[PDB]
Amino acid sequence: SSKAASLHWTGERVVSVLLLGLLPAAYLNPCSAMDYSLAAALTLHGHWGIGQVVTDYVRGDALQKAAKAGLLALSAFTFAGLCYFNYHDVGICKAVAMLWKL
Amino acid sequence: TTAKEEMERFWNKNLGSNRPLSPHITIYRWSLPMAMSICHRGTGIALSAGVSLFGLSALLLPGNFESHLELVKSLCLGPTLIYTAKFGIVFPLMYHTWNGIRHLIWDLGKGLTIPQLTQSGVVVLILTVLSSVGLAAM
Amino acid sequence: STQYPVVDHEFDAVVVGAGGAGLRAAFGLSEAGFNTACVTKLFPTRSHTVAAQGGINAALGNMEEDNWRWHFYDTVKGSDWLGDQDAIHYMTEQAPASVVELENYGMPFSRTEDGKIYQRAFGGQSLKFGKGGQAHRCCCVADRTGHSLLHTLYGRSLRYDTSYFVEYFALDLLMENGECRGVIALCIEDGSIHRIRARNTVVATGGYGRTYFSCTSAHTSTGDGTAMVTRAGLPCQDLEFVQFHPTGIYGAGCLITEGCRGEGGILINSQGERFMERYAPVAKDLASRDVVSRSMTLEIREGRGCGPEKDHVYLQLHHLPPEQLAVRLPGISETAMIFAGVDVTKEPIPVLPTVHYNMGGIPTNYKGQVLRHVNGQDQVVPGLYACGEAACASVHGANRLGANSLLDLVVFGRACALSIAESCRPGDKVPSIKPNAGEESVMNLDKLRFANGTIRTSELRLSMQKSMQSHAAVFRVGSVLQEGCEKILRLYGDLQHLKTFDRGMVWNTDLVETLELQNLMLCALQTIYGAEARKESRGAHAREDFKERVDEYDYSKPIQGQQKKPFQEHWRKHTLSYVDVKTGKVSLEYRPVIDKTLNEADCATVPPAIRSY
Amino acid sequence: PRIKKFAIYRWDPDKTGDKPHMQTYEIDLNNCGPMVLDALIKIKNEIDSTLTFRRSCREGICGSCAMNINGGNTLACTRRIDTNLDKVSKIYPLPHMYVIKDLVPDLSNFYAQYKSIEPYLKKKDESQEGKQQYLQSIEEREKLDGLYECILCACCSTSCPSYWWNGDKYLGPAVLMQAYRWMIDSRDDFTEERLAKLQDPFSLYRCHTIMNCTGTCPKGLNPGKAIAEIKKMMATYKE
Ligand SMILES: *Cc1cc2c(cc1C)nc1c(=O)[nH]c(=O)nc-1n2C[C@H](O)[C@H](O)[C@H](O)COP(=O)(O)OP(=O)(O)OC[C@H]1O[C@@H](n2cnc3c(N)ncnc32)[C@H](O)[C@@H]1O
Ligand code: HEM
Ligand SMILES: O=C(Nc1cccc(-c2ccccc2)c1)c1ccccc1C(F)(F)F
Ligand code: SF4
Ligand code: F3S
Ligand code: FES
């Protein structure tokens, strides 16, 4: 008889305030350590966000299930794709920095 | 008869009937709060799409990030057109960020009256335009 | 008849009415383990009793020391000795127990310093049997005491397996050989016809204020159970007694609470003089409703009106602290501004006495059993109960006391439940009804649905409302009342001529409002004829020809050695009215008021005296 | 003479293959009360009695006549007609609801949702009820203001986009505020288990704070605020 619905909701706001703190944190302190934490916080928040759009609009039996799976794939693929970028390239931070003074 | 039985019958009755759904989005009064709830979804979606496109192409496409930037320099757009692309990125981000803070203030229980909505609504709107112009110019 | 689907339901008990009384009766029956149906033409919350404002009386003794027996004395005095004291004993004794029951249900009563229920002063109440000054026993949820009463009773009602026939218009009683078998009803939702049968049947259909052109009462206050009892040939009681509430708004006639006055609100004429000090010296503007309103109506007569056309009077509130108005009267603060553009904290409300309560209704036991009159004697109609405003236990008599109907509701609703629970058993033989019973209701329903005549339903309703308004008002005279009678009778003749437009089955409001019109007329006829015959001034009924209060004795002087008047010579008796549904003739009889209480040793009978405040 | 035009939504289920349409009526405002219901009543009585709507108190305290006037959900008996004759008053039934006939929506589900939250006092030992008035302090009673006044008109829930898309599984502002009403009634003993009854993603957690519900409430109440107040209890209540 768990209380997951409320926990999940809290989780969202916890990573919301995290992500908010992380944007100026990244500007002031641009480094490898920020590149990953930014990649985690970003995909998670995005994942839960779209998950709400899904639970709102996707009316259906085997549809609700499918959309949630395809979202999970997309989210997982995203977190890896980002982590790959942080390992094998300049990373989220330096990449923005290059893009801007252009 | 129970509350659960009543709903189950409500839906049995209406779905098998020739009753029409009263118009909703077609006729309801446009408000700033409304538009701003819509825009938060829109900007929210657009941003995740952009993030995922950045992650996916980093896995699927060849060449390093510099090789991708050097390709943008190829069709060298005018300094103002580059500022446009730059403003078009920061705009949805900033809107969603500021309106996001507003959403968070709400979850604390604070600022939830009709006047406070319209007021905080304009503050967000103004804060978007300023920070969007201010960042694009950096 | 091949056109109409007949659907038979079987139950232990049927309650017709989802008001305050209706609900308490309804779920009270289910609590005693009875398979109960509740038939209502509105969603239960929408029932009038939401409009309730002042409070609900109980001698809880929350503000000072109180005794229920003092509340007893007050109501019977108020009743102008037409109120049956056996019922008034029962009600006022049960008062505190019944109100506590409601608070315990979760009714959000306003609180005091002690944390107890907040009681307030109201028109007509006293301590120490009149000798002790103003009483504070009006239990209230701020200004919205009825809304909360109805909503908590409904909240509670959801705990039991009662069957709610929501938005079903009850057409007639199912009657077989003097006994009640249930109700035949139209389901508004799909135009179908349902015969709901039961051992016992409770009528709690509220008042008939919509007989008049100006009323505080809702658009659905059309005396429908009253008309059903009438169509059965059963008598109605005291129908000429129509409460004119002193403080109804000038515009749409919406009620402004008497609570206003109990909180310190004052009544003002054109010259600023507090006119209620002139009429009632001791009780002032906290006097009985019949006295205040007749004083108001009389102040307009003399030329002291208050409008730009001099036709109303002001209820002043602005001298009371702003926070008192905010906490005590927030709901009339809103509706005064909405309907009259009035700031209560700075300006007075334009108020005019308007129709409000029906102390008449279905004659009843203190146990809530419908009485017929055989051979000048009382007689219980088997399986038929009535409670609330639609009834007449005459706990109210010739003039209802302020904040006593919400009490009426709760007590007698409950009483109906206990009377059934304590007489018969659940799962007892539900009496079988004839295969074509309630046939004439469907035929009546059919004619009105396809009614192609000359006079539109709305138009005739107007003719009735304006007639009752000018012929049977606060004051009435023989000649004026007679033109009223021969006018209403002519308008009953007009009923065979009405035009209806909507021919559909689903939600035919065009149709129902015509059913309502037949119901209204049958109520109006008995009001006006009984009014014309009553040749005395008693309570709300004030005859300008016969300003005297006619009792068995001249109760002003000593009782000692006097001639007691024969029954058909005095007027201290209930009016019993019948009407032949076809010819529209009103014939009337009379039955005595009940003076003995349930226990002289616990609650002493109050004999008639000179009644002024 | 001051003539005001009304465009009203119409549909008759008893008419063979009839589709929803608008019908316009014209009313002299000098011979009519100030409120929209007054017009409806007048056009019903005098012009067209095929017009079908719910009404009772004309006082704004029963909640029967709730409908969509000129965009927003209010009560027709409290909304005065805009005397501006150049504008035309558009009258619709409560948004995204199954229409029974004309302006009469099927509210069956609305009420059932209300039932599912148990809007009555619940005590752990109800073996003493009906004999002593329960003690509630004046301060404990203020906490119910802006909550008990609700009239169940269903204006807010019907102005709610989440209640449009998910009216089946989501309880909506109206019902939710009453769950809150009983949560903080100091006389109630079932506060924890009232919150546990919302522990799924639909019942409560389908509001994303659109606040369109509160803006529309005809009684001035704030269901939005009370919902966000629920959410806070949900995250914080222990055991
Ligand atoms: C008019 C009024 C009365 C009033 C008041 C304020 C106003 C504006 N304030 C009061 C107060 O503060 N204290 C008090 O003691 N009384 C006050 N009153 C008087 C009192 O409210 C009424 O006497 C009382 O509400 C009557 O209640 P009752 O239980 O009799 O039920 P109802 O509210 O009148 O509603 C009638 C019910 O019956 C059903 N019905 C009616 N006809 C039919 C038919 N045709 N078929 C099926 N059902 C029917 C209705 O559905 C409703 O449920
Ligand atoms: C990194 C870029 C961001 C992305 C990709 C993103 C993505 C999303 C998405 C997809 C949603 C769901 C939309 C909805 O349910 O209506 C959402 C909602 C939300 N976002 Fe963001 N977001 C970003 C930045 C931020 C920031 C910086 C904040 C901090 C203020 C924030 C705060 C919120 C909040 C509080 C919600 C939920 C509001 C609610 O429905 O109650 N977001 N976001
Ligand atoms: O769909 C949403 N609103 C929506 C979608 C489409 C149209 C309208 C709308 C437009 C005009 C007037 C009224 C409503 C409103 C919406 C938007 C943001 C967050 C959550 C939601 C929702 F909860 F899922 F409902
Ligand atoms: S909170 Fe307001 S809009 Fe919602 S049901 Fe109550 S009165 Fe109607
Ligand atoms: S969809 Fe409704 S509940 Fe208020 S928070 Fe929402 S407007
Ligand atoms: S009809 Fe009573 S609220 Fe409008």
Residue numbers in the entry:
A (entry chain D): 35 to 136
B (entry chain C): 6 to 143
C (entry chain A): 10 to 622
D (entry chain B): 9 to 247
From the paper:
The enzymes of the fumarate respiration are anchored in the inner mitochondrial membrane where complex I (NADH-rhodoquinone reductase) acts as a proton pump that is driven by the oxidation of NADH to NAD+ and coupled to the reduction of rhodoquinone (RQ) to rhodoquinol (RQH2), while complex II, serving as a RQH2-fumarate reductase (QFR), transfers electrons from RQH2 to fumarate. In contrast, mammalian complex II catalyzes the reverse reaction in mammalian mitochondria, where it acts as succinate-ubiquinone reductase (SQR) in the aerobic respiratory chain. Since fumarate respiration is the major pathway of energy metabolism during adaptation to a hypoxic environment for many species of parasites including adult A. suum and bacteria inhabiting anaerobic environments as well as some human cancer cells exposed to low nutrition and low oxygen conditions, the pathway is one of the most promising targets of chemotherapy for both parasitic diseases and cancer. In spite of the similarity in amino acid sequences and three-dimensional structures between A. suum QFR and porcine SQR, flutolanil specifically inhibits the enzymatic action of A. suum QFR.
Instead of the isopropoxybenzene group of flutolanil, the R2 groups of the flutolanil derivatives 4, 5 and 6 are bulky phenoxy, phenyl and pentafluorophenoxy groups, respectively. The IC50 values of the derivatives 4 and 5 for A. suum QFR and porcine SQR are comparable to or even lower than those of flutolanil, but the derivative 6 inhibits both enzymes less effectively. In order to analyze the decreased effectiveness of the derivative 6, X-ray structural analyses of A. suum QFR and porcine SQR in complexes with the derivatives 5 and 6 were performed. The derivative 5 is bound to both enzymes in a similar manner as flutolanil: the phenyl group is situated in the same site as the flutolanil isopropoxybenzene ring and interacts with hydrophobic residues (A. suum QFR: Leu 60C and Trp 69C; porcine SQR: Ile 30C and Trp 35C).
